[PDB]
Amino acid sequence: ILGNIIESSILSPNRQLYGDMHNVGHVFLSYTHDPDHRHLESFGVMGDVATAMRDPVFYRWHSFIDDIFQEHKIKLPAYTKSQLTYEGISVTGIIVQSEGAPVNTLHTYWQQSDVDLSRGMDFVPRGNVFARFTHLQHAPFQYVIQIDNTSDAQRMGFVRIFMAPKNDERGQPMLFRDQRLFMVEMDKFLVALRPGANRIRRRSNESTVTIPFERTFRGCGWPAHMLVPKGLPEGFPADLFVMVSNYEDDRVVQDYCGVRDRLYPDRKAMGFPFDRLARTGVDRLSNFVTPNMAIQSVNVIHIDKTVPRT
Amino acid sequence: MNYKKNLLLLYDRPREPIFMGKGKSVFDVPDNYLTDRYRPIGPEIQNRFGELAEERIPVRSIALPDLRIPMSLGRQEQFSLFIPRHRKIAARLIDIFMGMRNIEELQSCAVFARDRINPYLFNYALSVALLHRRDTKNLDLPSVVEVFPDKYVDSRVFEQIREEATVVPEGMRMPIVIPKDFTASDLDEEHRLWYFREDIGVNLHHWHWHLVYPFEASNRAIVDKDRRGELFYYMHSQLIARYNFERFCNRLQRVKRLNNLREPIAEGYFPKLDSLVASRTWPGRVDNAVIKDLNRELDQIKQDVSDLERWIDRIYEAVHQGYVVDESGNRIFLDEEKGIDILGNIIESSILSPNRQLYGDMHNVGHVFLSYTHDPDHRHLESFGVMGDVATAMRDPVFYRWHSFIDDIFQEHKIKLPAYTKSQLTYEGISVTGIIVQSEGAPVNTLHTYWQQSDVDLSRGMDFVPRGNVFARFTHLQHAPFQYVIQIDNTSDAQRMGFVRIFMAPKNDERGQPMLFRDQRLFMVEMDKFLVALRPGANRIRRRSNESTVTIPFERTFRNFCGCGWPAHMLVPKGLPEGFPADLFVMVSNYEDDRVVQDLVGTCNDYCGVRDRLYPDRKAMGFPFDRLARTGVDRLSNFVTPNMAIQSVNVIHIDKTVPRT
Amino acid sequence: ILGNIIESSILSPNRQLYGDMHNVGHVFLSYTHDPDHRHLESFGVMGDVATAMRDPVFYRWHSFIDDIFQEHKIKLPAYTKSQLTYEGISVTGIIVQSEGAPVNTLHTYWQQSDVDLSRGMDFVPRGNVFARFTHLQHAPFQYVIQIDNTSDAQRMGFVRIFMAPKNDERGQPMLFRDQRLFMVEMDKFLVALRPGANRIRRRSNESTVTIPFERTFRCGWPAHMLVPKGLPEGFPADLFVMVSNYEDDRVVQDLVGTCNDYCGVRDRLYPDRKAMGFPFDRLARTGVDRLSNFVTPNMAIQSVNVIHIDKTVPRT
Numbered sequence A: 001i002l003g004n005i006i007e008s009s010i011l012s013p014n015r016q017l018y019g020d021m022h023n024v025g026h027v028f029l030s031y032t033h034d035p036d037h038r039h040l041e042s043f044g045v046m047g048d049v050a051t052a053m054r055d056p057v058f059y060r061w062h063s064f065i066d067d068i069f070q071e072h073k074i075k076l077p078a079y080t081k082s083q084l085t086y087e088g089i090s091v092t093g094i095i096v097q098s099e100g101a102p103v104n105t106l107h108t109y110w111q112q113s114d115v116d117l118s119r120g121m122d123f124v125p126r127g128n129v130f131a132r133f134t135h136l137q138h139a140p141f142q143y144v145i146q147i148d149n150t151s152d153a154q155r156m157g158f159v160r161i162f163m164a165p166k167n168d169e170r171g172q173p174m175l176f177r178d179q180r181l182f183m184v185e186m187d188k189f190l191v192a193l194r195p196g197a198n199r200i201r202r203r204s205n206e207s208t209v210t211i212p213f214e215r216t217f218r219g220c221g222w223p224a225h226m227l228v229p230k231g232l233p234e235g236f237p238a239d240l241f242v243m244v245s246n247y248e249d250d251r252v253v254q255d256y257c258g259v260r261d262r263l264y265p266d267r268k269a270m271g272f273p274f275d276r277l278a279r280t281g282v283d284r285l286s287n288f289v290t291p292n293m294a295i296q297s298v299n300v301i302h303i304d305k306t307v308p309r310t
Numbered sequence B: 001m002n003y004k005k006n007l008l009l010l011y012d013r014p015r016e017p018i019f020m021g022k023g024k025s026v027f028d029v030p031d032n033y034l035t036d037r038y039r040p041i042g043p044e045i046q047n048r049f050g051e052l053a054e055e056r057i058p059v060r061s062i063a064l065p066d067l068r069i070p071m072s073l074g075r076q077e078q079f080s081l082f083i084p085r086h087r088k089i090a091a092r093l094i095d096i097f098m099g100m101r102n103i104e105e106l107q108s109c110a111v112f113a114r115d116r117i118n119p120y121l122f123n124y125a126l127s128v129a130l131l132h133r134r135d136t137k138n139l140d141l142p143s144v145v146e147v148f149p150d151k152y153v154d155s156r157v158f159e160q161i162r163e164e165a166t167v168v169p170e171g172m173r174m175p176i177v178i179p180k181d182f183t184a185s186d187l188d189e190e191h192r193l194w195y196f197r198e199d200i201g202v203n204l205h206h207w208h209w210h211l212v213y214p215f216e217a218s219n220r221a222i223v224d225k226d227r228r229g230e231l232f233y234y235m236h237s238q239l240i241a242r243y244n245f246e247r248f249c250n251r252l253q254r255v256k257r258l259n260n261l262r263e264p265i266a267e268g269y270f271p272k273l274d275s276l277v278a279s280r281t282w283p284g285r286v287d288n289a290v291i292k293d294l295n296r297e298l299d300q301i302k303q304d305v306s307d308l309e310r311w312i313d314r315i316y317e318a319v320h321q322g323y324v325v326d327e328s329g330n331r332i333f334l335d336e337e338k339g340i341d342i343l344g345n346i347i348e349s350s351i352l353s354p355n356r357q358l359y360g361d362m363h364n365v366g367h368v369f370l371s372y373t374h375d376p377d378h379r380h381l382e383s384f385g386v387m388g389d390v391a392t393a394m395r396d397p398v399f400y401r402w403h404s405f406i407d408d409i410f411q412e413h414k415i416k417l418p419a420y421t422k423s424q425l426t427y428e429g430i431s432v433t434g435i436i437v438q439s440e441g442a443p444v445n446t447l448h449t450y451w452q453q454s455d456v457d458l459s460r461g462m463d464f465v466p467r468g469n470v471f472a473r474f475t476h477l478q479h480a481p482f483q484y485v486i487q488i489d490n491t492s493d494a495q496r497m498g499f500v501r502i503f504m505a506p507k508n509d510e511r512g513q514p515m516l517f518r519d520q521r522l523f524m525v526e527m528d529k530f531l532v533a534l535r536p537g538a539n540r541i542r543r544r545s546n547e548s549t550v551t552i553p554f555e556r557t558f559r560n561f562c563g564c565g566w567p568a569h570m571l572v573p574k575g576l577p578e579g580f581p582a583d584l585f586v587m588v589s590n591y592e593d594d595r596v597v598q599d600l601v602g603t604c605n606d607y608c609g610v611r612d613r614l615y616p617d618r619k620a621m622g623f624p625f626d627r628l629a630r631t632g633v634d635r636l637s638n639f640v641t642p643n644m645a646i647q648s649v650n651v652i653h654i655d656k657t658v659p660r661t
Numbered sequence C: 001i002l003g004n005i006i007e008s009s010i011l012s013p014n015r016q017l018y019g020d021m022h023n024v025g026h027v028f029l030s031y032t033h034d035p036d037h038r039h040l041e042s043f044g045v046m047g048d049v050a051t052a053m054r055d056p057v058f059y060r061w062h063s064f065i066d067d068i069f070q071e072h073k074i075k076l077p078a079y080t081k082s083q084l085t086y087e088g089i090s091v092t093g094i095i096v097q098s099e100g101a102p103v104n105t106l107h108t109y110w111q112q113s114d115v116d117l118s119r120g121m122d123f124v125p126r127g128n129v130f131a132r133f134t135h136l137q138h139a140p141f142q143y144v145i146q147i148d149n150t151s152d153a154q155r156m157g158f159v160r161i162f163m164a165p166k167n168d169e170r171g172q173p174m175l176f177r178d179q180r181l182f183m184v185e186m187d188k189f190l191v192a193l194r195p196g197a198n199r200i201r202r203r204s205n206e207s208t209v210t211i212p213f214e215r216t217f218r219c220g221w222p223a224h225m226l227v228p229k230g231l232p233e234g235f236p237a238d239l240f241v242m243v244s245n246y247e248d249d250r251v252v253q254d255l256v257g258t259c260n261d262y263c264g265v266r267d268r269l270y271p272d273r274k275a276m277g278f279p280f281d282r283l284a285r286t287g288v289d290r291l292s293n294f295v296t297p298n299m300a301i302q303s304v305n306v307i308h309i310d311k312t313v314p315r316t
């Protein structure tokens, strides 16, 4: 509801009262240079969805808006130990492995790619016109998750993978209240677990948050090369987190893939483990955890070089 | 593969154990698949029926979910989808069969379950699974008459069929005549409508419609079909239109609705059916029975009449208000487009209802109340009467009263919609100048009807009866074949696409006057709706009666929309011996507006087309006449636009029995 | 809320709309014999709280009213396995023992008691006027509950004891949906559990549902009516106990607890955060079907037999 109210979608239960808050903000910010049209100038970059993210103020305005949503989320009751426990299931470890790199280590760098802008160049002599984009890229990797069943029956589960910074700006191990808002979703997929223990593997390129290279260059798809934060040359410390929830509860009976048409495939709230405040006694991630969750220290290394695509 | 054909053997002889062997086959069942009663002497039995068997189907022993819930219903009990508890049992079993990934495990699960659960329930649960799995598509399910003849035939025949099959050798067996007009004498004027109420055809159509459009299970398990709410409204609405027609052909007035539930029900009905599965008969309802508060602890029914009345009061309010309220508290508006569809889901109570808890389960609960007047607190350990089962509900006259009431509620919404403007139902350029009908050896604009015996093999359904054939002779209404001939002028300069919409109503009333629109619009029965391409200038369109999109062939039944299909022999009202006057109406609408862009090869009751996503007509169901007249209009002959035509038809009945040839 | 709406207490959020439903019903039922006052007659017994329970119609009218409340309770979400489990605590058995009677057996009978009605007899020669009441009575008994801690720390818990019929009127083992509504509260008290094993014993006369003889004659439910009558041939009944986590159920409060007719509860708050009738007020969670599979470790069931004996014991 709140979302439709704030952005102002015709789905808002009372547009007239609660207004067109997000959208009107984009216009105000884009017209500071000429607000009464006396200079016959058009809107700046924040006035177009196509270009809005280029401006730093975008993140300030969208940061504010988020705080308003948060104000609602902190009213919701904390998830109980019960609610995010999976009776029988226990995750005992998660790691990541890249080719030619230590365990629990992600790498990033720059990479040139080519795009044919020929169809867009009006009144230009026909032919090919290739442009070379430089953009962040990460070395391919894969998660390896150790899950024990101890039930006697095949258990269905949702694997939910987020990643946040390990410490704060002052260099201390982050508290939950802070860290919960910095967790970025990395993957969410359905898995069948055989009784006893199974060792689950997932490639970085199978991510349900991401869409392939081919789609961009040639919800609805975050660029694959932007999946991993940049990190530092000296290495940036990060907590990798995984949760296995009970898919039977989370299931949405129905016939990146294709979320347009019918329903969204997860009954749980979006950002589910961390959308709400901590239950009493919880203070940091390492004591928020239930058996069916696992934490892992990852180190994100950047290298200022321009690699190829082979 | 074979598997598809092997499941069809489960439908054979429902009460004979699965190890007894069906047709030219027999199942090689594990011993842990044998029932507790028979397992302790399984060796002696498997041996005893092993003889004379051609082929032998193996069955692998699988896990099998807990079948507690499916087995909760007794084996000698009746099964109805109206009863709250049965719904939960069936929906759970459907879930099991539906949840078997492979067509081999479905065969194994089925073979085990079959002899542990209620036959009627099994048949339903299987039927639903097969019809809506992907591997078991285009599969021709045996007619439910052939598997359960007890729901379709006077109980008297059963002891004749047993005699004939035991005494007389195969090949020399006489066909068993099925009694007609047997539920009441001429002291009851209602007995005249036997040929409609008690006709095998229409009862099968009703049962099947509810198969393909259930109101409970899972949206992917077939509940959320396009405009199923509107379908529920229209189909049932056409039943009463057709019934009211047949009433006029038997010197009766239009069916009176169930005004209010406290007043007695004048018309009793003893159905004369004997359930061989329950081993009992269906109870009758006496004259002037009164609805009573139900307390059927076993069935999980605790409903008061006032509950029903409360639901009705609320639904009326919503309809007048013009909007409903969902569980969340939000308002949804009963607009021109989706209003009727919503209302349908509210009234029948399909899980698609935007607020079941508030607006209730009005139609369904009514069926239960009416079926339990004779034993509402279960003190007499009696089952529900005929109105409690979709398979048999149409036999009772009260069906039409209850369904008549329900229709009035829908009407209350339709009369709020804005009249179709001259513009909206004109086709610029197109003009229909005449329509006629012609039967072989009969004047123009004249339809004939009569009685006709047909034969059906009830052999598969006769449990513990000496094997062989058992043919039964049904007598049923039939019409002489005919064809429409429609004269349409283009005057445009381009090929025009159009929908031909053909309805038929009575010409006058019972008081002898040319009917007014307000009245007549509700008595129009759909006769055909088909797409036609018109060349510039003049076009002579011809259409056979047997091409009707309202109807399904003989062959399908024996072997009124968007379900199984309406029986072909019931397409034409009976009429009178002296001739019954009727207005035939045709309209050509602009198919470009009415078109529903979609890809389909079209599909059957299992007419084809409606199993694909969408319903193939953007216009409302009953489109020319669903809404009130625009200003100035008063009767059909001044409602008409150029692209419509009227024709006086005369319907003649002849009391004779023709053969099928 | 619903309670204040239905009875009609000035606490009703809209008296004018939802009316004075319970109370007005009492008046209607009491005035059938003279509703327009043409006969100058007063109201029958249902018109006075003091006497209303004497009439059988009371239970019909109050039965209806209850169905309305139920209609709300069945909308509430089922208690989850989690919500009524006490991690660590396990009840392994409960029994009852009366002096000179088999285990798991309650006895009832008639008993005369005496009351001085002297102060109430106006214009009667002064002196004593003792009246002999005959009323149901039960032999004294005590519960014995076996609870295991398996935690390593002292655990606080609420003991919640209800009793229902075992079967129905037709003689079949009752389903939960039915039986949950027939459970009568028998006791609810706080207990401290030591690590390992604990044997809890509780007397019938310590019941928090009941008030002593002396209080009533010489506000709470009469002690002699604590146990149903049962049959001469014995009436089968399921005794149920639950130990809930008192830390969740606790109501931080300062309390006097001295016969303010039952401890009292005249202090601001009611001493239990859980709903009244808490184990059984709501519908069953999925899969549950009867009491014996509703149970969690921290609960226990026991077959009791209630025997009546048609004899008159003295009051002692």
Ligand SMILES: [Cu+2]
Residues within 6 Å of the ligand: A022, A026, A052, A062
């Ligand atoms: Cu924005």
Ligand SMILES: [Cu+2]
Residues within 6 Å of the ligand: B206, B210, B236, B390
């Ligand atoms: Cu129906």
Ligand SMILES: [Cu+2]
Residues within 6 Å of the ligand: B363, B367, B393, B403
């Ligand atoms: Cu119906």
Ligand SMILES: [Cu+2]
Residues within 6 Å of the ligand: C022, C026, C052, C062
């Ligand atoms: Cu009262």
